[PDB]
C-alpha cells in the first residue's frame, strides 16, 4: 500500500531484523529499488538455482549430461530429502536432482549435485569465473543454513544474487535450451510457487526459489511482472529476527504488495 522503500523500512522495524532487497529490470539490469543491496545475507536453499546453473554450464561444455544417472547410499542422505530418499535403489539423473533441489528443495539432491561441480569451492570458482566476486559457498547441506551472525560463509548480497541470476537467464553464457530449463525449474517450484500464485492478482507471472535458516533467516529470489511476462527480478533476504515464520512470510508478501501497487517507476 505504501511506497515499496517505505514499506521495506516498516517490515525491518516490525521484524526487529535486517532486510536486504533489490528490484532489478531483467532485460537491461537497471536497479529500480534497493535496500541493504550491498550487505551480506545467508543464501540458504536459494543457492540451488545458481548451483543448477553451473550444472547446465557443464552439460553445455559436454562435461555433464542431464540424463546421467547418479547412484547414492542411504548414508549419503541428510535431513529433508522428500524425493531422493525414494530412489536409493534406482538412483536419479542429474536433471532430476536439479528438479528435486529447486522445486521440492531436497537437501540431499543439492549435495549430490554439489559433488559434480567440485564442492562449494568448485561452485564459488564458477561464480568468480562468471563475474560474481562476492557470493561464496563454503559448506554443504545443511551446515550452510546455520546463519551465524557476522559470518560471511555461504552468503551473498541482494545486488550480487540478482546480477548473477540475470547473467544465467539472459547472457549467452548458457545455451538457449539450458536457460529454458533453469527458468522452467523455477516456475515449477512446488514449495511456495502455487501459494504465491494463489494471492497474486490475475495476469502476474511468477517463478521463484525461496530459503529459510536459523535466527529467522528467510529469503526469496523471484521473476515477477504484469501481462503474464517476467519483467523484473526481485531478491529479498531476512536475517537475525525472532519473528514466527508466518509473520516473516507476511512481511515479504507485504513488500511484494507494495511492488505490485506501485509497479510503474
Ligand X SMILES: OC[C@H]1O[C@H](O[C@H]2[C@H](O)[C@@H](O)[C@H](OCCCCCCC3CCCCC3)O[C@@H]2CO)[C@H](O)[C@@H](O)[C@@H]1O
Q: x/- site string to ligand X, residues 123 to 162, per CB under 6 A?
A: ----------------------------------------
CA dihedral 167, 168, 173, 177 (to 10 degrees): -140
231 catalytically annotated: no
Which residue do the cell numbers 545455451 mark?
175
67 catalytically annotated: no
Structural contact between residues 221 and 164, judged by C-beta atoms closer than 8 angstroms: no
Cα distance between residue 45 and residue 58, in whole Å: 21
- What is the 3-state secondary structure of 166-230? HHHHHCCCCCHHHHHHHHHHHHCCCCCHHHHHHHCCCCCEEEEEEEECCCCCEEEEEEEECCCCC
Q: What distance lies between CA 100 and its chain's CA centroid?
A: 14
Is 212 near ligand X (CB under 6 A)? Answer: no
- Cβ of residue 218: shortest distance to ligand X, in angstroms? 11
- Cβ of residue 222: shortest distance to ligand X, in angstroms? 3
Which residue do the cell numbers 523471484 mark?
222
Whichever of 89 and 199 has its CB closer to ligand X, that residue is: 199
- The cell for 162 is 540478482
Q: x/- site string to ligand X, residues 218 to 257, per CB under 6 A?
A: --x-x-x---------x-x---------------xx-xxx
Is 17 near ligand X (CB under 6 A)? Answer: no
85, 143, 214, 261: the catalytic one is 143
Q: Out of 201, 227, 246, 264, which residue is the one contacting ligand X (CB under 6 A)?
A: 201
Whichever of 144 and 252 has its CB closer to ligand X, that residue is: 252
Annotated catalytic residues are 45, 143
Q: Which spans of this chain sit near ligand X (rule: CB under 6 A)?
A: 196, 199, 201, 208, 220, 222, 224, 234, 236, 252-253, 255-257, 259-261
Amino acid at each position: 500500500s505504501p511506497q515499496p522503500l517505505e514499506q521495506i523500512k516498516l517490515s525491518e522495524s516490525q521484524l526487529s531484523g535486517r532486510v536486504g532487497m533489490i528490484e532489478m529490470d531483467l532485460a537491461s539490469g537497471r536497479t529500480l529499488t534497493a535496500w541493504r543491496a550491498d550487505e551480506r545475507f545467508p543464501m540458504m536453499s536459494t543457492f540451488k538455482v545458481v548451483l543448477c546453473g553451473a550444472v547446465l554450464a557443464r552439460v553445455d561444455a559436454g562435461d555433464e549430461q542431464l540424463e546421467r544417472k547418479i547412484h547414492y547410499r542411504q548414508q549419503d542422505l541428510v535431513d529433508y530429502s522428500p524425493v531422493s530418499e525414494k530412489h536409493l535403489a534406482d538412483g536419479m539423473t542429474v536433471g532430476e536432482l536439479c528438479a528435486a533441489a529447486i522445486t521440492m528443495s531436497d537437501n540431499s539432491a543439492a549435495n549430490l549435485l554439489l559433488a559434480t561441480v567440485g564442492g562449494p569451492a568448485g561452485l564459488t570458482a564458477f561464480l568468480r569465473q562468471i563475474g560474481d566476486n562476492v557470493t561464496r559457498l563454503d559448506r554443504w547441506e545443511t551446515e550452510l543454513n546455520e546463519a551465524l551472525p557476522g559470518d560471511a560463509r555461504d552468503t551473498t548480497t541482494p545486488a550480487s544474487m540478482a546480477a548473477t541470476l540475470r547473467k544465467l537467464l539472459t547472457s549467452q553464457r548458457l545455451s538457449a535450451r539450458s536457460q529454458r530449463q533453469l527458468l522452467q525449474w523455477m516456475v515449477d517450484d512446488r514449495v511456495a510457487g502455487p501459494l504465491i500464485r494463489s494471492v497474486l492478482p490475475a495476469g502476474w507471472f511468477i517463478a521463484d526459489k525461496t530459503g529459510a535458516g536459523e535466527r529467522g533467516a528467510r529469503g526469496i529470489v523471484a521473476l515477477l511482472g504484469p501481462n503474464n511476462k517476467a519483467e523484473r527480478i526481485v531478491v529479498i533476504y531476512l536475517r537475525d529476527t525472532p519473528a514466527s515464520m508466518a509473520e516473516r512470510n507476511q512481511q515479504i508478501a507485504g513488500i511484494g504488495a507494495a511492488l505490485i501497487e506501485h509497479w510503474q517507476r
